[PDB]
A = this chain, B = another copy of it.
């Protein structure tokens, strides 16, 4: 039979791969390599096995990076290279819950070529990701799987931090995709968000007490959950937030997640 895709966690997966993964076609001599992949830190290796498990396809590997200094850094990776697996599992998932940013174009190209069985590099047309945003902030807000996509995006690109009395902030690393950032600001009713640019490291942040409450309650009330390290950071964040007077009193920081 075919892949049933009415399950929201597949939207969470798209969010995760849109944030930190990739779906490309590359030149392997006179042949082509099609690959859906994602690389994360060792702290998220279990998350990659979870992905492998949910998708039923793929391979989890560990890569050793030879640093300049002579040391070795580690990363873990999940990828799918089997053409039939891509056509039967991945295509249907992304068709059902397409990516939100311009990265979506990478998908259409990947898909068009894959389904046409292009295998020699010389039969492959030229491609450069468009600079125009595929969707407007309102097209995003009209998508009924936004909140699910968002947990996967947060899993990959959000950050919870408590710093020195004390203050709490929620940030989302952006890679010039304001339409998505505005959809998030709106959907979550975040008011005191300040944008930044630290070494072209553009991000969106907020520390106000109500904004934090809104973020915590959206994350907490969503049936779609953080699965890897990001979940631990979140739970540690709450653990801390409970000790900060102005926050723990302003609302009921939940104890179950």
Question: Smallest CB–CB gap between A44 and chain B, Å?
Answer: 14
A222 contact set on B, CB distance < 8 A: 223
Interface residues of A in 131-179 (CB under 8 A from B): 142, 144-145, 147-148
Q: Is A69 an interface residue (CB 8 A)?
A: no
Q: Is A201 an interface residue (CB 8 A)?
A: no
Given A144-B256, A257-B144, A8:B53 Cβ within 8 A: no
A225 contact set on B, CB distance < 8 A: 6, 8
Among A2, A11, A223, max chain B CB count under 10 A is at: A223
Q: Which residue of B lies closest to A222 (CB)?
A: B223
Known: A6-B54, A8-B8. 15 other contacts (CB 8 A): A1-B49, A1-B52, A3-B53, A4-B50, A4-B53, A6-B227, A7-B9, A8-B224, A9-B9, A11-B223, A142-B256, A144-B256, A144-B257, A145-B223, A223-B223
A residues adjacent to B (C-beta < 8 A)? 1-4, 6-9, 11, 49-50, 52-54, 142, 144-145, 147-148, 222-225, 227, 256-257
